[PDB]
From a paper:
To fully understand the substrate binding and catalysis mechanisms, co-crystallization of XYL10C-ΔN and xylobiose was also completed at a resolution of 1.7 Å. Superimposition of the XYL10C-ΔN-xylobiose complex structure and the XYL10C-ΔN structure yielded a root-mean-square deviation (RMSD) value of 0.24 Å for all Cα atoms, suggesting that ligand binding did not alter the protein conformation. The xylobiose can form several hydrogen bonds, such as with Ala131, Asn132, His168, Asn218, Glu300, and Trp372 around the catalytic pocket, which provide strong binding forces to stabilize the enzyme–substrate complex and to maintain effective catalysis. Structural analysis of the XYL10C-ΔN-xylobiose complex indicated five key residues (Asn132, Lys135, His168, Asn218, and Trp372) that are involved in substrate binding via hydrogen bonds. As shown in the structure of the XYL10C-ΔN-xylobiose complex, the side chain N atom of Lys135, located on the loop 2, forms three hydrogen bonds with the hydroxyl oxygen, glycosidic oxygen, and O5 of xylobiose. The OE2 of Glu175 shows a distance of approximately 2.9 Å to the side chain N atom of Lys135, which permits the formation of salt and hydrogen bonds. Moreover, the carboxy oxygen of Glu175 can form a hydrogen bond with the nitrogen of Met137 located on loop 2. Thus, residue Glu175 of XYL10C-ΔN, which interacts strongly to Lys135 and Met137 of loop 2, and is in close proximity to loop 3, might have the roles of stabilizing the substrate conformation in the catalytic center and affecting the catalytic efficiency of XYL10C-ΔN.
MEY-1 is an attractive candidate industrial enzyme that has remarkable activity and favorable thermostability.
Residue numbers in the entry:
A (entry chain A): 2 to 335
B (entry chain B): 2 to 334
The structure:
């Protein structure tokens, strides 16, 4: 009995994990045995291979092969897939970021439209959902739109546009895929969360399909919003007639860990999972990978790490050790 | 003079250990030096390589190579082998769990029949025994059958079927292989143990061969059933005209160990081994690996470990340290 059995028993669609597949993880038999364990993981998200630079490496030249290897692997484990992501400021190829000739509203809008419509149409119902727009909102000022190539060139309309063209692809191919907005620092009430709720409201008012909001939940031990804080934040979204999901959960510490900060981690994993469990329309929890060995964290937040449910004290391709954080998740579901 | 010498002096067939071989353990010279120590280990069980996903990775395409590698390594240090296992709910290949079309009773039964019969036939008397069915019984409610792809599709009959088709193989090819049922939480009196006894009674009544029950004996320090409790429970099984074996013994603790929990561990290893020693038709004790470094425990139970007879304080590829638990086993014998 594991996290995914427990989550499905609580009415959730999955307990899930991201994985950086295709990749070195596939060469680690101890990692893969646990990835493939449907007791723990009934959902998954590709960490990288469906992002824009990998799927459209040159303008109008699509590459689906790595993404399809990921989907094939997921399917063999009966995992529902959160496809991630269509439009984001990061991991953009050079033809977008540094074009020989400058984009116009017209020309970049067409690039966005073609990228969205082709990826959604191509993969169809292999995806349970798409993260159609990722991280459109600023941290400063918190309410406002992020400055990025899409925003700067198209304006705020690029968000509605992305959902509109993803909707066109689902309608044109009679798909069931759900359309999500995904962001971080929207897991607690505040101007950024409110701004995300206003995106949902605006789309709904325009009869543009939007099914859910992804709450990334990249947290630091001790800074994580309380379970109660997450409960009321989740309710604010779901009252807009959408689902939510916890999409990228990990709870990083300042290295090295100690007894206090490990105890904080367990509490913060518990709080986030418990808040999902208390929320009728939170459809599931996904961790942003489950093995510290392969976690994005220590590359991205210097002097932080230890963020995942398992680790390998002897490195890649050696046995896993389950952390107390895992039990925090399981208890939250029971 | 080691555990296996002592067990054999007491009328047992072995003291044994599982090993996850082929694998990482083969690259640890201090691990393999002890594995190959026949003074301690005269029996072994493959932790993974003889399971369904490895031996029939696609339907009616068998792969025996890994298993044969295990058997060859075992033969080199004169070990008797508990081959493990034929039918089990877990560790099944995606051609069985994620079929192109739905299994029915008929089509799955033939999958079962074919797996069991070809593995038993193929390996013949390289195996002392097969765990023909593993873990058929539920914990909740304890009495009952476990829901799995075999039971859901084929019904309770899948158990008698597996043994029937194993018996066919032994009869066809004139084998000595013993046929075991193997399970956990049946090491003490209660509904699950009584249910496993009922399986044996049912098979015997229908003249299906069943030679033993394997008592996994994955215990927690201080929760292990007393020696006396194990002695009765073992007698309840052996009175049905079968053998028993202690098949997967380990005694895990909540980390870190302390003087009290380590003393409990020694007492619990002693109790289990001593119960087998007391029991004429308990044929041997196998531990579920012998080196903490490679134990299954830490990947499965958060905050637990230290379950085995040896550990390596300096990590993989460094010398083993023999724990007090080892002397508990020896003294029991
Ligand atoms: O906010 C954090 C960020 O995580 C992203 O995932 C990736 C990361 O972008 C990439 O460099 C690294 O190599 O892989 C990790 C996972 O292995 C995610 O796409 C974003 O939504 C999120 O913002
Ligand atoms: C995990 O599943 C994938 C997809 O079937 C497979 O390629 C891989 O070998 C599996 N690894 C395990 C079970 O260790
Ligand atoms: C397509 O992607 C695959 C794997 O990600 C890569 O090997 C190949 O070179 C890419 N480009 C192509 C096929 O043009
Ligand atoms: C645990 O780590 C945290 C974060 O670095 C620190 O604030 C705290 O003092 C540490 N406690 C110890 C070392 O006992
Ligand atoms: C253990 O025996 C096996 C099988 O003969 C052999 O391959 C291995 O080298 C041995 N290792 C030792 C004795 O350290
Ligand atoms: C030893 O460990 C056990 C189990 O965790 C615990 O109950 C007991 O209090 C510990 N005794 C000590 C530290 O002396």
């Amino acid at each position: 009995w594991g996290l995914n059995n427990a989550a499905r028993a609580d009415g959730k669609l999955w307990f899930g994990t991201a994985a950086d597949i295709p990749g070195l993880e596939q060469d680690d038999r101890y990692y893969m045995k646990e990835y493939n364990n449907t007791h723990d993981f009934g959902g998954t998200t590709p960490a990288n291979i469906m992002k824009f630079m990998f799927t459209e490496p040159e303008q109008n030249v699509f590459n689906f092969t790595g993404a399809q290897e990921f989907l094939d692997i997921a399917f063999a484990s009966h995992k529902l897939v959160r496809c991630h992501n269509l439009i984001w400021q990061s991991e953009l190829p050079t033809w977008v970021t540094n074009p020989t000739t400058n984009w116009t509203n017209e020309t970049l809008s067409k690039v966005l439209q073609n990228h969205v419509y082709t990826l959604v149409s191509h993969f169809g119902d292999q995806c349970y959902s798409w993260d159609v727009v990722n991280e459109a909102l600023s941290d400063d000022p918190a309410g406002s739109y992020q400055n990025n190539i899409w925003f700067d060139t198209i304006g705020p309309e690029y968000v509605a546009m992305a959902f509109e063209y993803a909707e066109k692809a689902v309608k044109d191919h009679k798909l069931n895929v759900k359309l999500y907005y995904n962001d971080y620092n929207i897991e607690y009430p505040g101007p950024k969360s409110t701004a995300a709720q206003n995106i949902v409201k605006e789309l709904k008012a325009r009869n543009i399909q939007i099914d859910g909001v992804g709450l990334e939940s990249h947290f630091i031990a001790g800074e994580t919003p309380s379970q109660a804080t997450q409960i009321t934040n989740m309710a604010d979204f779901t009252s807009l007639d959408i689902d939510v999901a916890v999409t990228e959960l990990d709870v990083r510490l300042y290295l090295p860990p100690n007894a206090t900060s490990e105890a904080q981690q367990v509490a913060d994993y518990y709080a986030t999972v418990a808040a999902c469990a208390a929320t009728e329309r939170c459809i599931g929890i996904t961790v942003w990978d489950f093995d510290d060995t392969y976690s994005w964290v220590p590359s991205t937040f210097a002097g932080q790490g230890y963020a995942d449910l398992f680790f390998q004290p002897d490195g890649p391709n050696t046995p896993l050790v389950k952390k107390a954080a895992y039990d925090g998740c399981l208890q939250a579901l029971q």
